[model samples]
Target: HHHHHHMVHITLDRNTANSWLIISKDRRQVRMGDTHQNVSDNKERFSNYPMVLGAQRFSSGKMYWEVDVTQKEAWDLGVCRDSVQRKGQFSLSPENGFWTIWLWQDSYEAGTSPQTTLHIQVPPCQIGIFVDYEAGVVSFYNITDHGSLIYTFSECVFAGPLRPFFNVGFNYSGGNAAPLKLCPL
Candidate 1:
């Protein structure tokens, strides 16, 4: 047998989301909003950032998930630890307990310890995220490029449950306000 671990269908956990972000009723999509929502702020909810976490969590295992980032001006996708700082303008990095990547202004980058810039000839319409908790590895793939490797985080220090992270990017007067959609995988 080969490749036993399949894609994990991660649903968006609205309870852990920033009120400024709007989550779909189906819990598979989310986007940044101009106005702050009137929802109660919980300890898990983000206070300053417009991002959300997946409902599913994993302490140790291998799983993959996909996101449709097509036709967007900017996007942020990754996985984070169970205890992420939800307030202030905290930096996103391994030290901050976030293993993330971003696509802004047609530029790609990895949110590593010091951040890594990615160069690709063809942009990815849909991105794939896979993690090996025990191996301490997080990889991103370009599905449009036939599963080409994008970037990876090696020697990671995963403590507790990890949740998939999502952000629709900043909506500058409705520039990149489209919803970030989770794929069927």
Candidate 2:
């Protein structure tokens, strides 16, 4: 199923750091949330840059996914929902059919905002991504990145699938843009 997806495409407003378009597995939806690093300002983004939406069958009921990102910024979260057929419904949290993976840079000396590779995986199904910046945490919630809780908040909703269906997302928190790559190998 991992071979079903090609690559994540991105389109920006040119004048702003925000994105405008994301095409994946024939799915489209407008889902947004505040930045995990900046909760004061309501910043949002489209979660599909270097999109992470392909799965490799590692075992019978277990699979690993490749969650690629184009940038590394604070307040960025990846929300994946089922195929577009499900429309705006983010994949069920903690459901057997959902998961969430993220890449963060802990450039700070010490804090919950440190850089880390977040992988929130589930067996034989899917995952979702959410952020509770007010609580200073970028959570995998019921699925992915369910490790730590920070004091900030932010998120972008991408798409997920049973197989042959997936997408990734990214957003900057308090600064500009930086490049990053995330894999499950």
Candidate 3:
């Protein structure tokens, strides 16, 4: 496919990150803050979601990227509509403008109306998200094991531009404190 040669380079959009989230200076990695940083209550910022958006926006074509979530106990990764709600604790389902898959403890779930549990024997240290905007498909892959399929959301009608979405979970006090790095090609 055309995406085989098109590797999307995503950087963390610090402006959209939650107040408790700490974004690296390089803007390629994000982690839950061990201590709260003084940040303005920007409307564009995520109030309850421990999430950040990609600097780049995609409206068409196939895009692919990988994230390093190694040792992280909890996280959510996928694509979200540019206009998706950023405030409050909203559903992370496609119906709510978010197409994502998450890991909590050793269990996994895809962001569906009725969330689907994924039975994965081994947790993926590295994850790859592929989006075919025109075809309306979003697929997740376990990059550690020769790109094994994780889950896919098909027939998605992206109303507008989509951006990479990431969350290191809300447990900022302790546990799941590792940085979620945007793996470089």
Candidate 4:
């Protein structure tokens, strides 16, 4: 992954239930499998040390990343991850199978201003629709509503590309967000 600005939109499938996304970074060269690390320079502004996993990262360039998802009930799914804060690890819910349009951008730092810095969540999946990132917001909608917003958040900003590595992951929660019900056209 490189670095760039991006906007993402997602649409969940009705047949399926949910989907998810994740982000992680590590500076260490080698260690046990799936090893994690902590960076000060990268996480200087945050309240928690960065969660690193090996030396590879999944973000780079001036584009966005998205995925369609399907899920089973009574199960925990990994969808998206927000910054680990004092309150807790913030995020979006309903990870697994459904359709979610999503994307990300990279900047010199994670946040340019205090307002720009946020802890948000990513959807777990999507269906038979194309996901797109537009303007500055990431949204998920449905065809019946003519792309009406099923879910939305005002946390992240479209920076540059993925030049620096960050930590993001989607996990299954016992409780679900409000994306379970939709009106059919």
Candidate 5:
């Protein structure tokens, strides 16, 4: 089914990164920086969200991208609506414009309503995100197996432009300090 799909390049929007999130100079990778920084507060900044939005936005078409999370103990990556809240704590669910997959403590979960628990024998080292906006589908895959689907959110509202979103979970002491690199096409 992927024979006809195309890849897209996405860069992290440094301006939208959380204070503790360190975005690579090329803006294609993000990792946890020192727990403290002098970054001032801003409306676009994720004050306590521990995430960053892509520099690109999608309103149509099928978009795909991947991320390397081998060394991280936890992560959150997917597509989110442009209007999703950027501040405070909130559930990363489709109802909130976030169709995400999370990995923590060697377990997987689709960030949907009620949050579906996933039992993947082999934790995905490289995660792929696919979005068919016109079809209202947002899917996640284990890239190592030629895109074995992990989960897919269907009938999405997609009220506004959707942007690739990322979060290298904060469990610094738990060995989650590695960077989440955006895989090249």
Candidate 6:
């Protein structure tokens, strides 16, 4: 009857962020910037995805965190292995060490290898991410509906520590410029 025990506090890692993203002063929110700021061309910085990783790393525990996606039309949320590729062109899926769910252009989808489209009665304003590292599971919930189930990834072979992943999709003519906020626990 309680979910608080699984809740965790997370913050974005500025060094792994894309130059096009402007992380908030508190590192709890991120959004696309109007102009790409000059950033280090290091291996940790994401040159392919407009994304960032959480500063908190987990290896063998359960964790739950929520994201406030209120007015965002396109964004991505989930967790990924700490060793996932940051400079390559790759899809967001378990095979690539990424377990995620996303929304784009009025469509919701799970980041499956082939992609799974989801049909929800109401688009969630805030979303919850739950991960059970030892169980090889990661789930996404519609927090706007009292933790309603949205999607789940099972049998994940986590070979290393993982970090919460976030991608603040393109502003694209100002259709999805809303900041993706890490909700207060």
TM-score of every candidate:
0.93, 0.27, 0.95, 0.24, 0.94, 0.96
Q: How far is candidate 1 from the true structure (C-alpha RMSD, Å)?
A: 2.0
Question: What are the RMSD figures for all models against the true structure?
Answer: 2.0, 14.0, 1.6, 14.5, 1.5, 1.2
Q: List the residue pairs that clash in candidate 1.
A: none
**Candidate 2 lDDT (Cα, whole model)?**
0.29
lDDT per residue for candidate 3 within 1-185, as digits (tens), equals: 23446687888888898988888889999988866678887888988778889989999999999999998889999999999998777888887799999998679999898989987766799998999999999998888877888898999988999999999996744777898998988
Model 3: colliding residue pairs = none
Superposed by TM-score, candidate 1 places the C-alpha of residue 149 at a distance from the truth, in angstroms, of: 0.4
Q: How well is each residue in 56-82 modelled by candidate 1, as lDDT tens digits? A: 888887888889987789878999998
Which of the predicted structures, 1 or 5, would earn the higher TM-score when compared with the native?
Answer: 5
Q: Pick the candidate with the highest lDDT.
A: 6
> Candidate 6: TM-score?
0.96
Error of 6 at 84 (Å): 0.8
Worst 10 residues of 5 by lDDT: 1-10
Ranking by TM-score: 6, 3, 5, 1, 2, 4
Predicted candidate 4 versus true structure: per-residue lDDT over 29-104, tens digit per residue: 1111122223222332322312222121223322332222223121111122222221224332222111122223
Candidate 5 — which pairs collide?
Answer: none
Q: Rate the local accuracy (lDDT) of all candidates.
A: 0.85, 0.29, 0.87, 0.24, 0.84, 0.89
Ranking by lDDT: 6, 3, 1, 5, 2, 4
Q: Point out where model 1 deviates above 4 Å.
A: 1-5
lDDT for predicted candidate 1 compared with the true structure = 0.85
Candidate 6, residues 54-78, lDDT tens digits: the string is: 9999999889989999988888899
Kindly report which residue stretches of model 4 are placed more than 4 angstroms away from their true locations once superposed: 1-66, 74-135, 143-148, 154-185
Q: Which residue pairs come into collision in candidate 6?
A: none
